[PDB]
Amino acid sequence: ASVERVYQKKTQLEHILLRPDTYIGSVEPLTQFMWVYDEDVGMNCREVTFVPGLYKIFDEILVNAADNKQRDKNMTCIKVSIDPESNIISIWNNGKGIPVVEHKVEKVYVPALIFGQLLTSSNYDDDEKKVTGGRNGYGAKLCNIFSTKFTVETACKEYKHSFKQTWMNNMMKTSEAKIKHFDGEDYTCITFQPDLSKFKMEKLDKDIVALMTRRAYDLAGSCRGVKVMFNGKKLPVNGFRSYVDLYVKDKLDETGVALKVIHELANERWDVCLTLSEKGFQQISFVNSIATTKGGRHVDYVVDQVVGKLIEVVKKKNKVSVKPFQVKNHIWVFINCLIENPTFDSQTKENMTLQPKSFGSKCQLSEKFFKAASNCGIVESILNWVKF
Amino acid sequence: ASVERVYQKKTQLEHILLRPDTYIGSVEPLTQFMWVYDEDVGMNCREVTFVPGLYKIFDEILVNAADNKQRDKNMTCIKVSIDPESNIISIWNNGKGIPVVEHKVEKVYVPALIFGQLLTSSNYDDDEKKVTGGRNGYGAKLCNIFSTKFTVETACKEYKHSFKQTWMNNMMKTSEAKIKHFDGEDYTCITFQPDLSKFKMEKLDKDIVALMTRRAYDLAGSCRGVKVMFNGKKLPVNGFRSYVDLYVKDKLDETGVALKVIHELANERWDVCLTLSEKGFQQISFVNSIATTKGGRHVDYVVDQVVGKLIEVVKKKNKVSVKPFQVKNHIWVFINCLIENPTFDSQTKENMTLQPKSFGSKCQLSEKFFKAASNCGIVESILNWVKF
Ligand SMILES: CCCc1cc(=O)oc2c(C(=O)N3CCCc4ccccc43)c(OCCN3CCN(C)CC3)ccc12
Numbered sequence: 104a105s106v107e108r109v110y111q112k113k114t115q116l117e118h119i120l121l122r123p124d125t126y127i128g129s130v131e132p133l134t135q136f137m138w139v140y141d142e143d144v145g146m147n148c149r150e151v152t153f154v155p156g157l158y159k160i161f162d163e164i165l166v167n168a169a170d171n172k173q174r175d176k177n178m179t180c181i182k183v184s185i186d187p188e189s190n191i192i193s194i195w196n197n198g199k200g201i202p203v204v205e206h207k208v209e210k211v212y213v214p215a216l217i218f219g220q221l222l223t224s225s226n227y228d229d230d231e232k233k234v235t236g237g238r239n240g241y242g243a244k245l246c247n248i249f250s251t252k253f254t255v256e257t258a259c260k261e262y263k264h265s266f267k268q269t270w271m272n273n274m275m276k277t278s279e280a281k282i283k284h285f286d287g288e289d290y291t292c293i294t295f296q297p298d299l300s301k302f303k304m305e306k307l308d309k310d311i312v313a314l315m316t317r318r319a320y321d322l323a324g325s326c327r328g329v330k331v332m333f334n335g336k337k338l339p340v341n342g343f344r345s346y347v348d349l350y351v352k353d354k355l356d357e358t359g360v361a362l363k364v365i366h367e368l369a370n371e372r373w374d375v376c377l378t379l380s381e382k383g384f385q386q387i388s389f390v391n392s393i394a395t396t397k398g399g400r401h402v403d404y405v406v407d408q409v410v411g412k413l414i415e416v417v418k419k420k421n422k423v424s425v426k427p428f429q430v431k432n433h434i435w436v437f438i439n440c441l442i443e444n445p446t447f448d449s450q451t452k453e454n455m456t457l458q459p460k461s462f463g464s465k466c467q468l469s470e471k472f473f474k475a476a477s478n479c480g481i482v483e484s485i486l487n488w489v490k491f
Numbered sequence: 492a493s494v495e496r497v498y499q500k501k502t503q504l505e506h507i508l509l510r511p512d513t514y515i516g517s518v519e520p521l522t523q524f525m526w527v528y529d530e531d532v533g534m535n536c537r538e539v540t541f542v543p544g545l546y547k548i549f550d551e552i553l554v555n556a557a558d559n560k561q562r563d564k565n566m567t568c569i570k571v572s573i574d575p576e577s578n579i580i581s582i583w584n585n586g587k588g589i590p591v592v593e594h595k596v597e598k599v600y601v602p603a604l605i606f607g608q609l610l611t612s613s614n615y616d617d618d619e620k621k622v623t624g625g626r627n628g629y630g631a632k633l634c635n636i637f638s639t640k641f642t643v644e645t646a647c648k649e650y651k652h653s654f655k656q657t658w659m660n661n662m663m664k665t666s667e668a669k670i671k672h673f674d675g676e677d678y679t680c681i682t683f684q685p686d687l688s689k690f691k692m693e694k695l696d697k698d699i700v701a702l703m704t705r706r707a708y709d710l711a712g713s714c715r716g717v718k719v720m721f722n723g724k725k726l727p728v729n730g731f732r733s734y735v736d737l738y739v740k741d742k743l744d745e746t747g748v749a750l751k752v753i754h755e756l757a758n759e760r761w762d763v764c765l766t767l768s769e770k771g772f773q774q775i776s777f778v779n780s781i782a783t784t785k786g787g788r789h790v791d792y793v794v795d796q797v798v799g800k801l802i803e804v805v806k807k808k809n810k811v812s813v814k815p816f817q818v819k820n821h822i823w824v825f826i827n828c829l830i831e832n833p834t835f836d837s838q839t840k841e842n843m844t845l846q847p848k849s850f851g852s853k854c855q856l857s858e859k860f861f862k863a864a865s866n867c868g869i870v871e872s873i874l875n876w877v878k879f
């Protein structure tokens with residue numbers, strides 16, 4: 104092999120297709136137990152087989168829609184549509200559209216810049232302490248790159264125009280945008296056909312659809328003040344507590360007693376529910392409407408408080424040494440939080456790494472919450488084990 | 492705020508400094524319990540305060556040295572030097588140097604291309620099934636960018652020349668390389684002064700030095716056939732079992748009985764040790780000499796086999812329902828493996844996501860290993876709990 108064959112340079116766009124894993128996650132199938140929203144049983148925990156990268160390109164567009172609530176607090180609605188037969192996904196939101204105007208530095212229309220060029224974002228000035236999920240300037244381009252067709256439609260009354268542009272063939276082909284007079288209610292709609300060949304798939308199957316559907320339920324629970332519709336029907340979830348009920352309202356512990364679920368909205372930025380786990384530590388958490396499926400410092404921050412107080416309670420009845428990991432082993436925690444300028448160790452944002460001192464707010468759970476936590480069966484489970 | 496202030500485009504080099512977390516991990520301090528190699532006590536588990544990104548720029552250069560064993564199986568030695576007072580770290584390796592010749596496409600010297608330009612690698616052709624840790628073409632440039640001074644010295648008898656070039660100021664300044672006749676034993680030496688201001692540090696303190704030192708011990712344990720020296724002294728670790736002994740040889744269980752440690756070299760590519768954990772599930776694992784500190788599919792692959800067999804053993808004595816997570820709760824596993832073309836969800840490579848069918852080898856543990864595993868106290872701990 105010559106020097107030029109061994110030592111190679113790639114462009115950024117080449118690198119994304121060659122090394123998708125750090126951008127969107129694995130492009131190969133994964134089987135694991137997780138929660139999905141199925142057509143027959145609704146929310147349930149089962150083995151699911153799906154391609155992470157396909158989940159993530161959908162998630163990037165969904166979180167971008169949620170992020171628009173920060174740009175326009177008057178936004179009220181996100182509508183998600185998935186048609187497996189035609190292979191078309193659309194995510195629509197109201198509130199302010201994107202300025203339909205030429206960027207005076209980049210010399211292209213703003214929507215074309217931020218959907219068609221890498222490393223473009225409204226989230227690069229961190230002196231603005233924002234609680235958007237967007238941070239890196241990649242997500243929408245990654246969806247475009249992994250789509251055979253990707254259409255951006257946006258209408259912005261302030262600029263008196265609507266914009267529609269379509270990319271094809273993994274963001275490699277496009278054509279002139281359609282610009283028209285607009286004076287109505289603003290919106291943005293992203294419509295895409297995922298490139299299933301990139302994921303070794305023939306069709307959007309039941310498992311990936313059930314996962315994407317569950318993300319829409321997540322958003323109904325996590326994004327305050329935004330209603331979510333899925334395939335033309337409003338999701339009947341009106342806040343985080345009602346979302347948590349989808350997991351725990353009909354569940355019993357192993358002794359046949361209903362799970363006792365405790366809740367506190369500590370402040371606008373921290374919503375916490377807690378109950379007993381009999382399957383080891385479990386957390387369901389969102390940072391800025393991102394599902395932090397590997398957790399992070401926000402989970403540790405909440406859990407450590409509970410663990411500390413419950414250790415105190417057990418100690419007043421253990422006259423041996425009960426260890427924090429043993430207490431955490433019995434906790435199922437649900438957290439919805441808003442973090443200023445969060446950091447993550449990957450574009451997929453599964454693990455939120457920002458230290459609590461930088462969150463921009465605190466979650467100081469009340470003594471009433473801690474007393475309630477001491478009554479949800481965790482203390483009993485620890486004490487019963489102190490006999491062994 | 493105008494359109495041009497809100498919507499911004501960044502260059503790749505700008506993006507790395509603005510968003511370091513997905514490239515090198517957090518640039519803010521972290522405190523956590525982990526294993527380090529201290530000057531007073533050697534290997535020990537304690538709270539450590541360190542900046543992950545600084546650990547990682549060192550790790551990138553260390554794993555690059557280990558990777559040279561794949562390019563030249565005759566390599567025998569890596570030498571690591573850390574001087575906190577002068578702020579100089581050097582990592583030297585023998586075996587083949589890098590070709591000191593002009594790349595005919597990029598029109599620069601090969602070492603200058605692959606240490607001074609982003610997205611450059613010898614690991615971009617995946618039809619070669621390699622067991623190097625390098626995959627993405629970033630690591631060495633990331634160290635350069637996060638260094639106030641970064642020097643590459645390499646000597647390659649085949650090309651009859653040595654090369655020395657220095658970059659300064661976060662890879663923003665350099666000068667003409669020094670090219671000289673060379674006809675001796677090949678080597679490469681990377682010498683850098685980390686930009687501590689990027690990590691809000693004044694000096695390489697005891698904690699970061701103890702972590703970097705431990706990585707050198709890891710390499711002595713993980714990289715077959717390569718001796719490691721640290722500050723001029725050979726590390727007395729001669730293979731993976733002797734490395735594992737640093738953790739477990741002097742440890743007792745809570746009843747005062749020495750931990751029973753079982754071992755199998757299943758084949759050249761899989762080395763496994765196992766013992767009892769009393770602190771919840773624990774794994775220490777390496778993929779291609781990378782410390783996979785969040786685990787991955789290689790850990791699950793090994794652990795699931797053990798868990799399955801131990802469930803069988805318990806069942807022959809539990810005449811209630813013992814769950815896999817309960818068995819895993821008692822496992823401390825150590826794994827050193829070589830995986831073809833591994834994938835990870837981040838440049839920091841903490842979590843290896845490649846599915847087992849793609850590993851290029853299997854680890855089928857023997858019935859003798861499983862019998863030994865049934866005698867290391869895990870089964871006893873599970874059964875004792877079956878009484879409760
Ligand atoms: C690569 C993508 C991985 C992933 C994507 C995704 O969307 O959800 C995931 C969820 C999950 O379903 N949820 C539900 C709500 C969103 C959320 C936020 C944080 C944590 C979890 C979740 C998940 O749950 C595992 C549940 N355990 C399974 C068995 N175990 C014993 C106990 C429970 C594991 C991975 C994912």
Ligand SMILES: CCCc1cc(=O)oc2c(C(=O)N3CCCc4ccccc43)c(OCCN3CCN(C)CC3)ccc12
Nearest residue numbers: 524525526527543709770773774775776777782783784785
């Ligand atoms: C951001 C960087 C994080 C990190 C970097 C690094 O180098 O090592 C780490 C290790 C660690 O020391 N080792 C030792 C050898 C290399 C290795 C490979 C896989 C897993 C672990 C490790 C670590 O251990 C936690 C040990 N538990 C702590 C308490 N707990 C109850 C039980 C034990 C946690 C994080 C890191």
Ligand SMILES: Nc1ncnc2c1ncn2[C@@H]1O[C@H](COP(=O)(O)OP(=O)(O)NP(=O)(O)O)[C@@H](O)[C@H]1O
Nearest residue numbers: 167168217224225226237238239240241242243291
């Ligand atoms: N639905 C939307 N409504 C309004 N603006 C949007 C919408 N979707 C995307 N944008 C804009 O397009 C930009 C680019 O989106 P994207 O590529 O996802 O980057 P990001 O969200 O800023 N960061 P990240 O998702 O972490 O890579 C965003 O910064 C927003 O300004």
Ligand SMILES: Nc1ncnc2c1ncn2[C@@H]1O[C@H](COP(=O)(O)OP(=O)(O)NP(=O)(O)O)[C@@H](O)[C@H]1O
Nearest residue numbers: 555556605612613614625626627628629630631679
């Ligand atoms: N010590 C070394 N000896 C020989 N070649 C080296 C050495 N260090 C680096 N290289 C070469 O320099 C290239 C660039 O290194 P690097 O930037 O770390 O990328 P990588 O190791 O290929 N992939 P990654 O580390 O995953 O970003 C490697 O691909 C090797 O060809």
Ligand SMILES: [Mg+2]
Nearest residue numbers: 167237242243
């Ligand atoms: Mg985004």
Ligand SMILES: [Mg+2]
Nearest residue numbers: 555625630631
């Ligand atoms: Mg490398």
